[PDB]
Structure formats: structure tokens, C-alpha cells
Write a protein that binds this ligand. Structure first.
Ligand SMILES: Nc1nc2[nH]cnc2c(=O)[nH]1
Ligand SMILES: Nc1nc2[nH]cnc2c(=O)[nH]1
Ligand SMILES: [Fe+3]
Ligand SMILES: [Fe+3]
Lengths: 419, 419
């Protein structure tokens, strides 16, 4: 199974700069990149060449945080702060997933939107419902894209119409794990406690045991809202900071861990994140829409902390990680300005790096056009943006700032075209 | 000329709420709204009905600040704050408008982009060049959209490739004024000193005299960047604040005046703005892109200050005022958070109000569906956004957050369809 793609390649091997290869070739064998060069090796001559001409080829987007079950509230109900917000629109929407048919329907729309926007790998929070989450697993597997799917664990202080017993929660979680742990190579389970204020100690310890037992990655929320933070230290008077409680249960780095937002994290929480090698998911659109605050990304990057990007949909108003890239840069420009121009804002390559190679690394060797990497890619047709007047770097930047899904001509995950 | 439109009408008579009229009629005579009602009067029973069915009809977008000559820099060169950005990217690009053909080509692309995005009235900054600006006037008159066009006055501390002397600057400005202060009814001239840092006392004085003589509106920039502000106090050592400099020369409210950004305005400047009935043009996208800062919109609205929106293109990355609306709201949410939640963020209706009825009032009776107003409108087809699941308010919000020009099916200016 060999495929050869030709076009203008743009990717980031490192965060400081773009690697640009005009009219170059990418040879894919069994879904993985075997060769990337400006000249087609003779050992591959005679093979069909999928020539994308003057179009741009870039790696796919890797969204490390999105709530699949909140798709319907996209662009709606953003007049309340995190906690109040959940109670008014989010919980009522997620509760609807008790019905598997509603789930099939909504997740169907979600998946088509993700692919349409060029998201090739995504870390998703589903709902506490087992059957609907199982349906999401199957639909994702059928779609061809990669993903970490997490049945949501929430048994504490939740609404009567959207709550669960920790005993059932754990049994359902483990049941899901056993069913999908070895099924697909790109759609896998991930331990997903919603967050401290929603999980009892019983639940968290049980989830911690599951993560260890099955060597599974973890995902959850961290220091997104001030009131949220006050609730955590209130329920847990023995903790000095938010992330400490997760760590107490073995859900803070023992295995690859994703922590969303991390806007108001204290110095200690930051050090722990660094120490335990936790990955921070920067969700700028969500931070703006919910009025959560503005994350100091340069400060975290200076400390060597792993930072990726997430759409955090519903809270975040868009599935396009390209739009998330723009907002991350814009958010960083304000941090730069407030710091007296000391904390350099993000360059286009740095944010693009987060979206591709860095985020992709959570899923495996994906996110860059280098030998051995899965071929997750997008073909960008920017013919409506006067491309003739700009170099390749400017064209990618303009696609990011001025373009949209209309410019995405093709999607590939592990060498397979996704429709 | 009589025309009758039917569809779901959404507009804002006031900023606090939307007026929604499902399947209602708008009768237009000679370009102005004759009536707006759920039922069509018997008087027109024989007239054809332009039925837009389930589509949405909203007034056009009124962009109160954009640099027409910067169209080519959209999406690129945003890695520098104001001053160095001007010296390195903007001035060099504007210098090319010495060539009238480059101007016709570039301005042609601009106009198509504005119309495509639903901007029906726009306040534009051209370049200091007389011939190219005259061409812009002519092209806008041909296009059919409304606009205030301003040859840019800049004679102080400007590069050799982009400067003029105040005498010639004033002569060309008056030449243009006499040539267009009657020609078109919706495309008119506006006094345009670029801003204090590049305008001599002689120029500003001469411009204030022209403004008074021909009773013309004024448009400029105000307290957008800290270094810019520092330059003004340094050049005008006796001024108490930036805005005072413009007022000294009669360029601060004697006639309708537009002042863009107003991010770092002092308490005294703000009071002068309210006192002199000056209009603040909020340009959120630009403020993020150049790391200028974040404008405190609620603080100004609480003082009863006039506030409208501008794309500020090039600095701002998009001609879509719908995107600008989203950004203004998001920017306000962060200000709300930093104010301990005391200064409420903008509601969708408030920002929409700025873009329509308020911004429109600067051009005349435009921006709302009420008797007497010019019929500037857009027909939104949101069929790709699962409209069947949302009410009209939600549909509009979803168009603002998730939609784009592809949902803009038709646009009208003064009752005439614009292609
Ligand atoms: N962004 C976000 N944070 C959360 N914390 C708990 N629930 C949620 C949710 O649904 N969205
Ligand atoms: N945003 C912005 N501010 C300015 N101040 C002076 N010139 C400019 C310009 O071109 N853009
Ligand atoms: Fe989230
Ligand atoms: Fe400007």
C-alpha cells in the first residue's frame, strides 16, 4: 500500500520556524511517511502521483480538548460564567444524550464538522452515558479520524437529571475500556473525571486505579474559573492548590495527562504540572467567551511546560483549530503588551506547532512531515485569496486569518482520505 | 419605484434588545422604508412580493473605520506594535498608491471584499495621494455602497516615499471636497488627518478650517498605542492629553467626528469625548493583532458615549463586521472579568446595535427597519447551520459566531441590490 503526494509542503519540525518545500513529494507506505523530498526518489518512479499542483499541504489539526456532547450549543448561550453556564445550557444539553438516537444524530453532525474543519485527531469529553459514548466510539472508528474518547465521570454535586453513582460509573468506565482498549489503533479510551468539584473521592480513587491498571491517559479541567477554584479548595480543605487533589489520586501525570485551560494556576500548581509532565490545553476562544481570563502562554513555555491547543467546543465557539491558532496568538499579544513587551507573543509557527507536531505527539508520531510519522494531512486550496501575490508562509497565515473550511480540499488520516 | 420584501426580520431599535418579526413585510419606496408589519396592507395586494421565506433579513453592516489602501496586508505583517508596524509594513504599502493602476487593482479587490462581507456603509482612510483617492471615490460611487472617503493628511515626520507638505495637502483636500461635496449622495468626503504624530500644527489648523468651512465630518486615531501617546505628549508638551490636541484645532466634535481605538484614554479625554459628542470607533480585532490593548467599552457606554465598530483592516484581519462584533463581545467579557464582574459585558444586541443602527446613524437614517430609513439590508441564508433547531435570535448569533460570507445571499443599499 503505497501512495505519493506532491505539492507545496508546510510544516513545523520545531516551534521556531516553518519548514517549506515547494513542489515536493511525500511517499506514504502503510499510512506512515517513508520519504519527504523535493525530488521523487528513483525507487518510487512508476507509481501514481497525486499531484496537488500549486495547492498547500499541511499536517492535520490536533484538537486536544472538546466536548463532543455540546455541539448543539455552538455559538449559543454564552451570557454566563463557567459554573452558572453549566447549569443553564450545558448540563441540560448533555442530559439529552440519555437517548442514544439523539446522540447518534448530534455526534454525527459533530464528526462531520470536525472533518470539515480539518481536525484529524481529537481528545473528546462525551457524557456520563455509557451507551451513547459507545456509539461515539463506533462512529469515530467508522469516520477514519483519530481520537481519545472519554465517558465522563461525574457523581458529586451534579443535577438530578445528570448525575451518576460512583459504583456504576466505575463499572461502566472499565466496561468501556475492555471493549475498546485493543479494538482500534487510533480511537482509544481516556480516563475522564469531569473535574474535582464533580467527583467524589470514591470515584477519583477508582479512576486512578483504572488508569494505572490499564495504563491509560487522563483528561480533565484545571483552574479555568475563579469561582470554580474557590469551590475546589472549599471541598478539599487539605489541598494547597487545584492540581494537588488530582495528583493525590494518581490522575496528574503518571500517564499522559491533559489538563484544560489552566488560566489562574498558582506557582506551585505550575511547578507540579511541569514536574509531573502534565500537558496544558490552551483554549483561548473558550477563555474569551466565558470570560474566564487570559492564559500566560509564554510564561508556561519559558518553564518548558507542554502546551497544546483545544477548541473546547460550546464554550469555545468553533471547531476550527485554525481559528483557535489565531485567537491564541491574539491572546498572547495582549499578554505581551501587559508585560511591557517582555513576554514575546506567539509567532505563527509556534501556534501552528502546538496545533500540529506538539498536539499530535499525544496521539503518537503525527503532526509533522518526517519519516515514520502517520500521514495526517490537509490540502489547502487558497485560490480565492490572491495567492499569486504572497509567498507560502504568508499564504498559510492568510488561510488562518482570512480562510475557512471552504479552502480545505482534502483530509487524510494515516494515509487514508477522509470524507 | 416600489418594492416589497418578506422574510424573518431581526433588528435593533435600541441596544438592549432585538426586535424580531417572523414572516413580516417591508415596503420600500424610492429606497426608504414605507412600512414594516407582520401583515401586508391591502393597498399592495397586486404588487409582487420578494419572498425570502425562512431566510433572515437584517440591516447592513456599517464599518466606521478601515484603511482601504491596506487591503493587501490582511492576515500578514502583524508582528509589530503600531509605530514600527507603520514604518515597516503600512507606509511602504501605502506608498505604492502613487501608481493609480495599483490603486485601481487593489481598491477593486477591497470593494468586492466589503460587499461580499455585507458592509453597506464604510468610513475609509485612503492614502495621501490625490489621484488614487479620487479613483476610490469613483469606484465606490460605481459600486453602489455608501461611504465616507478620506484622503490622508500626513506631513510631519513621515518617510520620504510617503510625505507631503501641508500647503499641497490642504490644496488637494479642498480640490477633492469641491469635486464630491454634491456629486454622490451616499459617497462623501471626510477630513482625515492621519493622527497627531504625523500632522503639523499648520496642517491640523488648516484641516479644522476646512471642516468648519464645508461643515464636514472628521475622522482620526486616538490613544491606541502607549508609545504613540508618549510621542504626542512629547510633541505637544503643553497638552494635558491626546484628545486635547485635536480639540485645539477644531478637529474634535465641532462636526460629527470619528476617533478610532481610544484604548488608553485618560479620565479627562473621556469626558471631553462625551462633552464634544465625539464618536469612538471600537476596533477590537486590530487591538488584539497589534497588541495595542483592550478598550473598556462598558466604562464608556455607562458615560453615554457614542460607540461604534470598525474593522480597521490590515491591523484588523477581517472585513467582516460580524467577526468584529464577536471580538468586541469577547473583549468585553475579559474586561468584565477583570472588573470583578462589575462592568457587564456586551450582549449580542448591544454589539449588533453598534454595527447597525448606531454606526448607521453616522451616515444618516440607516441601520434599522423603521419608517423613513434607507433600505440597507442583508439576506442571510443559514441553511448549513441546522436552523430548524434554533429560534431567530439563536440563528443570528450562530451566524455571527460560526457563519461567514457564504451565508450572505443578498445585500441592498438604499433599496438597490448590490452585486
Ligand atoms: N470548559 C468547560 N469546563 C468545564 N468544567 C466542567 N464542566 C465543563 C464544561 O462543560 N466545559
Ligand atoms: N490601526 C492603525 N492606527 C494608525 N494610526 C496611524 N496610522 C494607523 C494605521 O494605519 N492603523
Ligand atoms: Fe472544557
Ligand atoms: Fe486604524
Amino acid at each position: 500500500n503505497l501512495k505519493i503526494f506532491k505539492g507545496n509542503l508546510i510544516f513545523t519540525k520545531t516551534s521556531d520556524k516553518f519548514t517549506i518545500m515547494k513542489d515536493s513529494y511525500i511517499v506514504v507506505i502503510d499510512g506512515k511517511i517513508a520519504s519527504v523530498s523535493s525530488n521523487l526518489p528513483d525507487k518510487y518512479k512508476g507509481n501514481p502521483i497525486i499531484d496537488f499542483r500549486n495547492n498547500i499541504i499541511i499536517p492535520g489539526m490536533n484538537d486536544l480538548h472538546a466536548h463532543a456532547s455540546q455541539y448543539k450549543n455552538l455559538g449559543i448561550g454564552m451570557d454566563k460564567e463557567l459554573l452558572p453556564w453549566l447549569n443553564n445550557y450545558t448540563f441540560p444539553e448533555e442530559a439529552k444524550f440519555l437517548n442514544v438516537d439523539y446522540a447518534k444524530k448530534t455526534y454525527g453532525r459533530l464528526i462531520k464538522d470536525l472533518i470539515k474543519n480539518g481536525t484529524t485527531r481529537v481528545a473528546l469529553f462525551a457524557t456520563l452515558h455509557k451507551d451513547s459514548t459507545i456509539e461515539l466510539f463506533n462512529m469515530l472508528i467508522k469516520s477514519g479520524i483519530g481520537a481519545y474518547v472519554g465517558k465522563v465521570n461525574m457523581d458529586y454535586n451534579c443535577p438530578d437529571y445528570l448525575t451518576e453513582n460512583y459504583i456504576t460509573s466505575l463499572n461502566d468506565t472499565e466496561e468501556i475500556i475492555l471493549k475498546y482498549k485493543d479494538k482500534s489503533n487510533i480511537v482509544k479510551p481516556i480516563i475522564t473525571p469531569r473535574f474535582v468539584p464533580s467527583c467524589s473521592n470514591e470515584l477519583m480513587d477508582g479512576l486512578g486505579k483504572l488508569s494505572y491498571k490499564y495504563r491509560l491517559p487522563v483528561q480533565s479541567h484545571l483552574s479555568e474559573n475563579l469561582d470554580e477554584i474557590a469551590v475546589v479548595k472549599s471541598l478539599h480543605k487539605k489541598s494547597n492548590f487545584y492540581g494537588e487533589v488530582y495528583d493525590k489520586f494518581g490522575l496528574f501525570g503518571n500517564t499522559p495527562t491533559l489538563m484544560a485551560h489552566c488560566i489562574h494556576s498558582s506557582k506551585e500548581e505550575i511547578n507540579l504540572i511541569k514536574r509531573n509532565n502534565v500537558t496544558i490545553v490552551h483554549c483561548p476562544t473558550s477563555n474569551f467567551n466565558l470570560g474566564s481570563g487570559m492564559m500566560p502562554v509564554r510564561k508556561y513555555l519559558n518553564l518548558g511546560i507542554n502546551v497544546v491547543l483545544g477548541s473546547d467546543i460550546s464554550a469555545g465557539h468553533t471547531c476550527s483549530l485554525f481559528k483557535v491558532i489565531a485567537y491564541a496568538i491574539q491572546n498572547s499579544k495582549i499578554k505581551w503588551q501587559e508585560s511591557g513587551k517582555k513576554d514575546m507573543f506567539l509567532s505563527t509557527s509556534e501556534a501552528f506547532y502546538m496545533a500540529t507536531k506538539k498536539g499530535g505527539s499525544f496521539f503518537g508520531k503525527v503532526g509533522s512531515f518526517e519519516e515514520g510519522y502517520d500521514f495526517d494531512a490537509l490540502v489547502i486550496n487558497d485560490s480565492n485569496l490572491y495567492p499569486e501575490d504572497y509567498d507560502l508562509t504568508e499564504r498559510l497565515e492568510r488561510f488562518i486569518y482570512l480562510g475557512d473550511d471552504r479552502n480545505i480540499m482534502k483530509r487524510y488520516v494515516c494515509g487514508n482520505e477522509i470524507f
